[PDB]
Amino acid sequence: KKIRAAIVGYGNIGRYALQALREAPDFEIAGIVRRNPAQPFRVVSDIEQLESVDVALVCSPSREVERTALEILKKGICTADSFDIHDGILALRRSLGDAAGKSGAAAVIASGWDPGSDSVVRTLMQAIVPKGITYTNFGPGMSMGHTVAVKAIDGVKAALSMTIPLGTGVHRRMVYVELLPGHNLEEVSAAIKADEYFVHDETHVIQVDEVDALIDMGHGVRMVRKGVSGSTQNQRMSFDMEINNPALTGQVLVCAARAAMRQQPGAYTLQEIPVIDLLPGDREQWIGKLC
């Protein structure tokens, strides 16, 4: 009566998802499906080589999630993913929802911490203070996407882009780079700041000897809403985290995989999942302990 789970994609998120599966008492690890061939678990290139898989934790890069989850859902296997492109979520939900309904499976999508767990908090805040404004403030922490953008710039040997919160959804970017031979900071800094990833934000570029000595997985959020409940003004709420980024994503994936097993066929964001479905075992213990 364990849930048999596979990890699909063994990058940073995959490793932490495995750690979370290992510690979850209601899961059994079916195996790891790896795209790039390279100990107690089966490691395969195709999910069909693992036995009796209930759910797949899709830990692939966002732009590979849809095609990967589609193939799995078509086999009647549930999926959990941490797709992180906010504007692509509705499209993904339509696509995976159609496949899931046809196979009898469920997909729980965009289930990291943002999008994902933060989405649940943001939705709750919107409901209980229906007028007003919510600000989501990230960091300090490494931006994977912005770091990728900097490494693409001519003359950059190594890069780290930190996201720093300045309040009201406004961010500062602190970019640390090693330079390639023959390139000077003046020109590389100018190229970074003009890039579409940086041009709208206060950005500082700092040359360092060793980018790897600066890297840490600590990250966080501060979400704030001020507004009106009913007709009553000046209601204030906030939600903060100081967390290990991929560690939390890995754990939310396990929660989402467990929840996928409890849904009717279709695709769901975490806004669409009762939070109690994210917890192992029957509901009464959690109502009694937490309600």
What is the distance between the alpha carbons of residues 164 and 141, in angstroms, rounded to a whole number?
Answer: 7
Q: Is 219 annotated as a binding residue?
A: yes
Question: Is there a contact between 106 and 268 (Cβ–Cβ < 8 Å)?
Answer: yes
**Residue 65 in contact with its own copies, rule: CB under 8 A:** no
Exposed/middle/buried for 258, CB within 10 Å: 0-12, 13-18, 19+?
buried
**Residue 2 in contact with its own copies, rule: CB under 8 A:** no
DSSP 3-state of 59: coil
Binding mask 23-62 for its own copies (x = CB under 8 A): xx--------------------------------------
Q: Which stretch binds its own copies (CB under 8 A): 2-10, 140-148, 165-173, 281-289?
A: 281-289
**Residue 188 in contact with its own copies, rule: CB under 8 A:** no
Strands 27-33 and 78-81: unpaired
Number of residues that bind its own copies (CB under 8 A): 68
Question: Is there a contact between 283 and 259 (Cβ–Cβ < 8 Å)?
Answer: no
Taking each helix axis as running N to C, give the angle between helix 89-103 and helix 62-73, from 0 to 180 degrees, rounded to the nearest 10.
10
**Residue 243 in contact with its own copies, rule: CB under 8 A:** yes
Strands 156-165 and 55-58: unpaired
**Residue 231 in contact with its own copies, rule: CB under 8 A:** yes
Q: What are phi and psi of 33, to 5 degrees?
A: -100, 120
Residues annotated within a binding site: 10-13, 34-36, 59-62, 82-84, 111-115, 163, 173, 219, 245
Q: Which residues make up the interface to its own copies (CB under 8 A)?
A: 16-17, 19-20, 22-24, 86, 89-90, 93, 110, 113, 115, 117, 119-124, 126-131, 134, 228-232, 234-244, 247-248, 250-252, 254-255, 269, 271-276, 278-279, 283-284, 286-291
